[PDB]
Every structure is written in structure tokens, then in C-alpha cells.
Amino acid sequence: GAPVPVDENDEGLQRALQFAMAEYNRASNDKYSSRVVRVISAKRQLVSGIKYILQVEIGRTTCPKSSGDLQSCEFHDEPEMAKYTTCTFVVYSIPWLNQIKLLESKCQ
């Protein structure tokens, strides 16, 4: 009948995590200009199995994804409130009937 919050006590979600790291690998194409920052929240829904709708805040920068070479790093100057992009992940996961996927990343 409705959505609910996700508990970080289940270690089975550590798999759906490797999914977001991939969709992101093809979303940043190059190796610079794009970079994630932090998570905004996460709620799980049900549709046969479970689903994880997250709201991430990704921005641009002079680094290759998370880590990389050189140091400095930054979203081009000090745009603590500029140059950014919100997005939401919709993961799918269900070991009870053979299922698990990654719908997509709703980013604008």
C-alpha cells in the first residue's frame, strides 16, 4: 500500500551498489568533468520484489570520477552552491524469483 525507508542492516544491498558505479561509468563518458558528491536519501518500494529510489547530488569537476591523480580537485572553482546536478537511482532487487536490475538514473 505504500513506500517505506530502507534499513542499512541488510548486507545484500552491497550488490546493487556495483550497479550504480557502472551506470555512472558510462554516464561520465570521459574521465573528468563529472563526479558524485553525497547521497540525499533512499526509500524502497515493492513491485514483486523490492526497489530502491535514491536521490543523489552529482556535480562536475577536474577529477576522474571519485579518485584519480593530481590533488586540488573541485567542481571548477568554489561553486559550493552552483555547477551541480540532482539525480535519482531506481534499483531493482529480488532473490525470491530470480531478479535484480537498475532501471536508470532520473537526472533531470
Swiss-Prot record:
Residues under site feature: Reactive site = G1
The short motif Secondary area of contact is annotated over: 45-49
First and last residue shown, out of the full length, are 32 to 139 of 139
Q: Where in the cell is it found?
A: Secreted
The task this protein performs is described as: This protein binds tightly to and inhibits a variety of thiol proteases including ficin, papain, and cathepsins B, C, H, and L. Although isolated from egg white, it is also present in serum.
Keyword set, alphabetical order:
Disulfide bond, Phosphoprotein, Protease inhibitor, Secreted, Signal, Thiol protease inhibitor
UniProt main location, coarse: secreted
Q: What is this protein called?
A: Cystatin
Q: A single GO CC term, please?
A: vesicle
Write out the coiled-coil annotation as residue ranges: none
Family per UniProt?
Answer: Belongs to the cystatin family.
Tell me the disulfide pairings in this chain.
Answer: C63-C73, C87-C107
Molecular function (GO) terms for this protein are: cysteine-type endopeptidase inhibitor activity
Q: Which domain of life is it from?
A: Eukaryota
User: Which parts of the sequence carry Phosphoserine?
Assistant: S72
